[PDB]
Amino acid sequence: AGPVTWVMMIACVVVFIAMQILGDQEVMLWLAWPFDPTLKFEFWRYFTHALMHFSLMHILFNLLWWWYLGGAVEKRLGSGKLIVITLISALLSGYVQQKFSGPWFGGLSGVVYALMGYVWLRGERDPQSGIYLQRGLIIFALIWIVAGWFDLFGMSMANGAHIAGLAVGLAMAFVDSL
């Protein structure tokens, strides 16, 4: 795990603590996708929705994936590559989720699904790079996208952000492996 891996884990933990103390809403006032056009110039909001988690399990699960895949990507292809996947995936996963959900969504799984698709397809097309997804985690990835289609867990899953993140990941793997 390099500095981008670390910093992101720090930022998410800081933001999570903030959320338990002040409550989720107060942090979301600052960090949620813009709900109102008065806030459209608050550029950070297109990304910061990725830093909010709504339970200990939520942040643990997201961060374990982030640490494993983000660390793999930073170790092999550099900080700059992890930053670009992360920033584009956050923006577009956020863009799609807000269409269905407005501001009421958050977490790093749009980004993690980008890392999934990215590491999966690059490792398929370009084994040379030395990054790949174990089929176990490929299978896990697909099941939760498919699980999302049926609104299980009282419609608690950001299906838009997952599929968008995967599309971005696959896309940038394709372009990169050309």
Curated annotation (Swiss-Prot):
UniProtKB keywords: Cell inner membrane, Cell membrane, Hydrolase, Membrane, Protease, Serine protease, Transmembrane, Transmembrane helix
Subcellular location: Cell inner membrane
Periplasmic compartment residues: 23-49, 98-99, 154-157
Transmembrane intervals: 2-22, 50-70, 77-97, 100-120, 131-153, 158-178
The keyword Transmembrane helix appears for this protein: yes
Known catalytic reactions: Cleaves type-1 transmembrane domains using a catalytic dyad composed of serine and histidine that are contributed by different transmembrane domains
Residue positions of the active site: 109, 162
Domain notes: The loop between transmembrane domains 5 and 6 is flexible and may readily open to the extracellular side to allow water entry into the active site cavity.
Primary role: Rhomboid-type serine protease that catalyzes intramembrane proteolysis.
Sequence similarity: Belongs to the peptidase S54 family.
Protein name: Rhomboid protease GlpG
Species, as recorded: Escherichia coli (strain K12)
Taxonomic lineage of the native organism: Bacteria, Pseudomonadati, Pseudomonadota, Gammaproteobacteria, Enterobacterales
